[PDB]
């Protein structure tokens, strides 16, 4: 059974991670396998939950790193960052529109 993973398969890889870790479903290519990591990678944010902590894909337009699904923390170079979203033109006020 894998590094910080406490439940396994050959087919599905990891099924439950250690307490404070996050589960990522890594696809490659036909395969989709469970992996447990301490922080989530770049596409993603950490999303702690009582039953299962989960890496969640940061979906939002031109964002490289978010806090939550809705709220960007770092926009791509060189967009303007205002109230967690990403714009070309900075309404009302180093590339962090405020």
């Amino acid at each position: 059974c894998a590094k910080g993973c406490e439940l396994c398969s050959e087919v599905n890889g990891c099924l439950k991670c250690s307490p404070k870790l996050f589960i990522l479903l890594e696809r490659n290519d036909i395969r989709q396998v469970g992996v447990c990591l301490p922080s989530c990678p770049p596409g993603y944010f950490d999303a702690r939950n009582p039953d299962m902590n989960k890496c969640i894909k940061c979906k939002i337009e031109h964002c490289e790193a978010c806090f939550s699904h809705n709220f960007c923390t770092k926009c791509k170079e060189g967009l303007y960052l205002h109230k967690g979203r990403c714009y070309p033109a900075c309404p009302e006020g180093t590339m962090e529109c405020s």
Binding site: N49, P50, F67, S68, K83, G84
Partner: peptide, 8 residues
């Protein structure tokens, strides 16, 4: 402060 969690 713009974003905060106190969850869990």
């Amino acid at each position: 402060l713009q974003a905060m969690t106190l969850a869990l």
